[PDB]
Amino acid sequence: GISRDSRHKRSATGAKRAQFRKKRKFELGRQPANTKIGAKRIHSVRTRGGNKKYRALRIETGNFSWASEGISKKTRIAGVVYHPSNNELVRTNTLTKAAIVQIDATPFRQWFEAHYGQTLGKKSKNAERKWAARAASAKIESSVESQFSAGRLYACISSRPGQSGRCDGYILEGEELAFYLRRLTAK
Amino acid sequence: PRAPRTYSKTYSTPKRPYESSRLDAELKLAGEFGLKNKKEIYRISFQLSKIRRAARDLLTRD
């Protein structure tokens, strides 16, 4: 039943405004999703002019995309590891935009193995020609190799689970990934 | 709801109420033109003053 009008707030100088209107419909807000992990459940809430809103709550499996490939796969998420506004959100494992999370991303692991086949650690002519065409690009760098070998990928959720019920996201690649890993290890 | 119906007054009374010269002039005019009350002379004076105001606001320009 919260409100979103400015008529309840103090003036820029500090003048206390009087009560001129009762709370109105267009200035309503409603309680946050605080979506969690486990046993997906989606609630549909009817808003101004129909416009059904899907409130994520305990959503488990989302969709996540690679940056350089434009390639997205559905995958489960292990749970949030950082959130830029709060640490209590990190602790209670809620999903919000611009939060970095760990994902198993074995869909991406098998995807890379089936696409290029360069193993970590330590046959058909069509596939040989395909690899010859798309070769000389699997020596990008070492951080992505280490992340893939560990098997827990750092992906930032960028959608709003409290509107569309989708913890859709993009993996961290390059500058943002370096920033967040430095942040988590900075102690 | 309804549109108001516009009315207006037709006579403006003289500011000085009792002076011999004006009182006798209006009385003689009414009596010799066969009028019963001063409403006629007041209303025609109001109209004549309206016309003279129009003429003044007209001739004040080139």
Partner: protein, 142 residues
Amino acid sequence: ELTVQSERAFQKQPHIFNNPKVKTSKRTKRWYKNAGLGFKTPKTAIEGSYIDKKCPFTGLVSIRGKILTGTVVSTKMHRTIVIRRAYLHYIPKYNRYEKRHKNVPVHVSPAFRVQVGDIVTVGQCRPISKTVRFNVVKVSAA
């Protein structure tokens, strides 16, 4: 200023990610737009490392409506400053004027180096903050 990433979050222009896979000249890419109406983006804003998601040139805001101008009166609060619009209110009873003024708070991008006693021009835009509704588009001082 010294550090761009002092924030907890990663400040980046939305929907702009630069592919490191290739190695091309000027590997960093930055996005900007012409606010129009004759104002030109500073050549220092051309290569600057700031983000200012509300900037009229690099951010996502757009300028439309009223173009105002005034002298900055205080510059102690971040990415935004307030100016004095000193005008004369006419009093038809006494046929004379009187000096009134309004402090309109507006937004300054890090591209411009503003100060008190400097003259700036601002443009009406989408509500940026509780009070801010303008961004500076040009500085007339030197």
